[PDB]
Design an enzyme around this catalytic site. Structure first.
Site, PDB file in Angstrom:
ATOM      1  N   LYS A   1      68.273  15.759  60.879  1.00  0.00           N
ATOM      2  CA  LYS A   1      67.263  15.934  61.922  1.00  0.00           C
ATOM      3  C   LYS A   1      66.016  15.188  61.471  1.00  0.00           C
ATOM      4  CE  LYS A   1      66.718  20.194  63.464  1.00  0.00           C
ATOM      5  NZ  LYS A   1      66.591  21.355  64.375  1.00  0.00           N
TER       6      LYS A   1
ATOM      7  N   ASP B   1      64.369  31.692  69.552  1.00  0.00           N
ATOM      8  CA  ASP B   1      64.938  30.651  70.441  1.00  0.00           C
ATOM      9  C   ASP B   1      66.467  30.649  70.447  1.00  0.00           C
ATOM     10  OD1 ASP B   1      64.850  28.617  72.355  1.00  0.00           O
ATOM     11  OD2 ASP B   1      64.407  27.005  70.894  1.00  0.00           O
TER      12      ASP B   1
ATOM     13  N   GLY C   1      62.665  16.989  66.663  1.00  0.00           N
ATOM     14  CA  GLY C   1      63.602  16.273  65.812  1.00  0.00           C
ATOM     15  C   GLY C   1      64.717  15.589  66.567  1.00  0.00           C
TER      16      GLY C   1
ATOM     17  N   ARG D   1      63.519  20.079  70.025  1.00  0.00           N
ATOM     18  CA  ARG D   1      62.222  20.016  70.717  1.00  0.00           C
ATOM     19  C   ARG D   1      61.497  18.757  70.267  1.00  0.00           C
ATOM     20  NH1 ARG D   1      63.009  24.971  67.701  1.00  0.00           N
ATOM     21  NH2 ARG D   1      61.165  24.157  66.617  1.00  0.00           N
TER      22      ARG D   1
ATOM     23  N   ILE E   1      73.389  12.117  67.721  1.00  0.00           N
ATOM     24  CA  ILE E   1      74.251  13.205  68.198  1.00  0.00           C
ATOM     25  C   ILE E   1      73.519  14.284  68.992  1.00  0.00           C
ATOM     26  CG2 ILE E   1      76.144  12.876  66.450  1.00  0.00           C
ATOM     27  CD1 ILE E   1      74.983  15.314  64.823  1.00  0.00           C
TER      28      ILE E   1
ATOM     29  N   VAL F   1      68.501  14.079  66.236  1.00  0.00           N
ATOM     30  CA  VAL F   1      69.656  14.433  65.431  1.00  0.00           C
ATOM     31  C   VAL F   1      70.664  13.295  65.280  1.00  0.00           C
ATOM     32  CG1 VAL F   1      71.203  16.351  64.844  1.00  0.00           C
ATOM     33  CG2 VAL F   1      69.268  16.744  66.393  1.00  0.00           C
TER      34      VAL F   1
ATOM     35  N   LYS G   1      69.146  15.935  70.164  1.00  0.00           N
ATOM     36  CA  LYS G   1      67.695  16.011  70.050  1.00  0.00           C
ATOM     37  C   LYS G   1      67.249  17.464  70.245  1.00  0.00           C
TER      38      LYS G   1
HETATM   39  C1  LIG Z   1      68.468  21.769  59.308  1.00  0.00           C
HETATM   40  O1  LIG Z   1      69.197  20.557  59.633  1.00  0.00           O
HETATM   41  C2  LIG Z   1      69.691  20.411  60.883  1.00  0.00           C
HETATM   42  C3  LIG Z   1      70.437  19.239  61.125  1.00  0.00           C
HETATM   43  C4  LIG Z   1      71.017  19.115  62.379  1.00  0.00           C
HETATM   44  C5  LIG Z   1      70.833  20.119  63.333  1.00  0.00           C
HETATM   45  C6  LIG Z   1      71.300  19.984  64.733  1.00  0.00           C
HETATM   46  C7  LIG Z   1      72.569  19.687  65.190  1.00  0.00           C
HETATM   47  C8  LIG Z   1      73.879  19.547  64.503  1.00  0.00           C
HETATM   48  C9  LIG Z   1      74.135  20.199  63.298  1.00  0.00           C
HETATM   49  C10 LIG Z   1      75.421  20.168  62.790  1.00  0.00           C
HETATM   50  N1  LIG Z   1      76.454  19.527  63.384  1.00  0.00           N
HETATM   51  C11 LIG Z   1      76.211  18.884  64.543  1.00  0.00           C
HETATM   52  N2  LIG Z   1      77.382  18.293  65.127  1.00  0.00           N
HETATM   53  C12 LIG Z   1      77.509  17.649  66.329  1.00  0.00           C
HETATM   54  C13 LIG Z   1      78.904  17.245  66.725  1.00  0.00           C
HETATM   55  O2  LIG Z   1      76.571  17.412  67.061  1.00  0.00           O
HETATM   56  C14 LIG Z   1      74.929  18.852  65.119  1.00  0.00           C
HETATM   57  N3  LIG Z   1      72.526  19.560  66.567  1.00  0.00           N
HETATM   58  C15 LIG Z   1      71.244  19.782  67.001  1.00  0.00           C
HETATM   59  C16 LIG Z   1      70.669  19.747  68.279  1.00  0.00           C
HETATM   60  C17 LIG Z   1      69.307  19.998  68.383  1.00  0.00           C
HETATM   61  C18 LIG Z   1      68.579  20.276  67.222  1.00  0.00           C
HETATM   62  N4  LIG Z   1      69.120  20.310  65.986  1.00  0.00           N
HETATM   63  C19 LIG Z   1      70.443  20.061  65.894  1.00  0.00           C
HETATM   64  C20 LIG Z   1      70.073  21.223  62.971  1.00  0.00           C
HETATM   65  N5  LIG Z   1      69.501  21.381  61.772  1.00  0.00           N
END
Ligand SMILES: COc1ccc(-c2c(-c3ccnc(NC(C)=O)c3)[nH]c3cccnc23)cn1
Length: 303
Positions: free
Chosen positions: A36, A137, A21, A19, A15, A23, A17
Site C-alpha cells: 500500500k 470501518d 493508499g 481512502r 490491485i 495498492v 485503492k
Molecule cells: C498493511 O498493508 C496492506 C497492504 C495491502 C492492503 C490492501 C489490499 C490487499 C491485501 C492483500 N491481498 C490483496 N489481494 C488482492 C487480490 O487484491 C489485496 N487490498 C486493499 C484495498 C484497499 C486498501 N488496502 C488494501 C492492505 N494493507
C-alpha cells in the site's frame, strides 16, 4: 538481510485503492506481497495504519499479516509503504461477487470474521499487553479471503486504541469517518458518545451484522441462493450520502431484508438471529464480538 524491506520489493500489478493508499501486488525474494503506497502528503494516514499494525500482540490468523512500514526514495520523490501478506482472492466483497458458498463456507467466513473482530476488541493483559481496538470501518471491501476460505480483517487506518486503566483513547476521533453505507444508527445521527470507547466497539458490531447479511445471501443450498448485493441496495442509491442512510436506518428504521428461505436452514436461522441482534439502534443492546464467535464456534462444531 532477512527482514522484508521496500528496496527488495518489485511491484508487478495495480490491485486496488484505499481512502489514500494505492495498492499493488509485488515480489519479494520470489514471494508475492501486497503493498500500500502513500505519498509524502499522506504521511499521517500511513503512520497511523503502521502504528495500529505494530501494536503489541496484534497478530492473529483473522487479522491481515503485517510485514513492514518502509520508505522508498526513487530519486525524485519518497513513497511511504505498508507491506502485508498477499491473498489471491482479494476482498470478501470480490469473493462474494464471484462465488456462492456452502453452509460450511458461510460459517467459516462469518466465524473467522467474528474471531478477528473479537481479537481486535479484546484487551490482552500481561507484560506484552494488547489494548482494546475498535476498527471504525468494517465492511466486506475491508476483509480479505485467504486460500483456506477463512477471513482476515484489514485497513486499520481509522482504528482507535483504548487504555482501560486511565480510561483514555489514543486519538481525538472525528465524527462519521467510515463508509456511509455501513455506519451504525448512532454514527448516522451523530448521537454516538465518543468519550466512551465501548461505543466504537458497538458501532463495529452493527457493521459486522451487515457483512454477515452479505455472506448469507451467497449461501447456496440445493442450488438456491440470492444474487450478490451490498446492504441497503434496495433502499439507497450507489454512493449514498449520510442523509440518505440516516432517513432509512434511523427514521424509517429499516434493516437489510431477511429472506423467508433463511428460516428453512439451522445455520441460516442462527445467522439471521445474530444479524437482528447486531442491528438494534442502541449499541448497548447489541451482541459482543466474543459472544458471536462463541455462537458460531458451537454451530461449526455441530455442523
Ligand atoms: C498493511 O498493508 C496492506 C497492504 C495491502 C492492503 C490492501 C489490499 C490487499 C491485501 C492483500 N491481498 C490483496 N489481494 C488482492 C487480490 O487484491 C489485496 N487490498 C486493499 C484495498 C484497499 C486498501 N488496502 C488494501 C492492505 N494493507
Amino acid at each position: 538481510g532477512h527482514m522484508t524491506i521496500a528496496r527488495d520489493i518489485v511491484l508487478q500489478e495495480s490491485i486496488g485503492k484505499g481512502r489514500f493508499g494505492e495498492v499493488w501486488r509485488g515480489k519479494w525474494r520470489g514471494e508475492e506481497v501486497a503493498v500500500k503506497i502513500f505519498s509524502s502528503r499522506e504521511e499521517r494516514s500511513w503512520f497511523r495504519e503502521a502504528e495500529i499494525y505494530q501494536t503489541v500482540m496484534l497478530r492473529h490468523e483473522n487479522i491481515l499479516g503485517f510485514i513492514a512500514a518502509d520508505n522508498k526514495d526513487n530519486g525524485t520523490w519518497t513513497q511511504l509503504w505498508l507491506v502485508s501478506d498477499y491473498h489471491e482472492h482479494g476482498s470478501l466483497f470480490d469473493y462474494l461477487n464471484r462465488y456462492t458458498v456452502t453452509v460450511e463456507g458461510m460459517i467459516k467466513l462469518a466465524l473467522s470474521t467474528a474471531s478477528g473482530l473479537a481479537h481486535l476488541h479484546m484487551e490482552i493483559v500481561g507484560t506484552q499487553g494488547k489494548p482494546a481496538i475498535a476498527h471504525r470501518d468494517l465492511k466486506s471491501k475491508n476483509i480479505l479471503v485467504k486460500k483456506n476460505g477463512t477471513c482476515c480483517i484489514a485497513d486499520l487506518g481509522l482504528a482507535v486504541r483504548h487504555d482501560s486503566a486511565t480510561d483514555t483513547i489514543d486519538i481525538a476521533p472525528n465524527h462519521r469517518v467510515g463508509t456511509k453505507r455501513y455506519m451504525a444508527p448512532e454514527v448516522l445521527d451523530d448521537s454516538i458518545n465518543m468519550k466512551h470507547f465501548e461505543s466504537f466497539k458497538r458501532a463495529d458490531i452493527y457493521a459486522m451484522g451487515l457483512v454477515f447479511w452479505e455472506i448469507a445471501r451467497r449461501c447456496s443450498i440445493g442450488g438456491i441462493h440470492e444474487d450478490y448485493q451490498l446492504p441497503y441496495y434496495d433502499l439507497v442509491p450507489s454512493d449514498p450520502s449520510v442523509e440518505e442512510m440516516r432517513k432509512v436506518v434511523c427514521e424509517q428504521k429499516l434493516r437489510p431484508n431477511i429472506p423467508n428461505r433463511w428460516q428453512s436452514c439451522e445455520a441460516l436461522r442462527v445467522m439471521a438471529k445474530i444479524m437482528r441482534e447486531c442491528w438494534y439502534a442502541n449499541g448497548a443492546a447489541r451482541l459482543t464480538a466474543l459472544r458471536i464467535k462463541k455462537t458460531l464456534s458451537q454451530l461449526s462444531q455441530q455442523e
